[PDB]
């Protein structure tokens, strides 16, 4: 034993869905109201999950990005992925298929640890129903979690659930 177990997590999804707001809530317990588009940013946090001390390396990605050899190179470092859409943006939900295919391509595998995240659950303008998201997640064999980066609903659960999926795959 040389130190804690390390887990490399990557947050993906369409522009504006709340990838950065979810990550900053986890790290800083702060809600970011401004929309500052991301290119690529990295964060770290030590936490305890199921009685195991873990070091989380979190990579926050761009939601507006053409094909990039450089995008593939950082995505291939990930061990697990949060696939994020916004519950008031039907196009972001339809884009989940594209993110899943991109991940399978870069990892060259059919069985990659992933969690489906439906964010902005605090807003009144829901267009994607809970049952539709749950059916999509069941079709992939992965968990679904509803979140709000503003209220903090589900934020810790999303990241911890992804770590649990990585552990099941390793073992
Ligand atoms: N009401 C509410 N607003 C949110 C929520 N999560 C994010 N937002 C808002 O949505 C906007 C975009 O959030 P942001 O985290 O920057 O999205 P992103 O997915 O990182 N965008 P990009 O891909 O361009 O980096 C911000 O104005 C933010 O305050 C939420 O759960 N509820
Ligand atoms: Mg961002």
Residue numbers in the entry: -2 to 168
From the paper:
The RAS family of oncogenic proteins is important as therapy targets because of the frequency of activating mutations in almost all major cancers. Mutant RAS proteins remain in the active state and hydrolyze GTP at a much slower rate than wild-type (WT) RAS.
Crystals soaked with PPIN-2 diffracted to 1.7 Å. For this compound, clear electron density corresponding to the methoxy-biphenyl anchor group was observed in four of the six chains. However, when these were tested in an orthogonal NMR waterLOGSY binding assay, their binding to KRAS166G12V was not impaired by the presence of the anti-RAS intracellular antibody fragment, nor did they interfere with PPI using a cell-based BRET assay. The previously characterized low-affinity Abd-2 compound does not affect DLD-1 viability over the range of concentrations nor does the PPIN-2 compound.
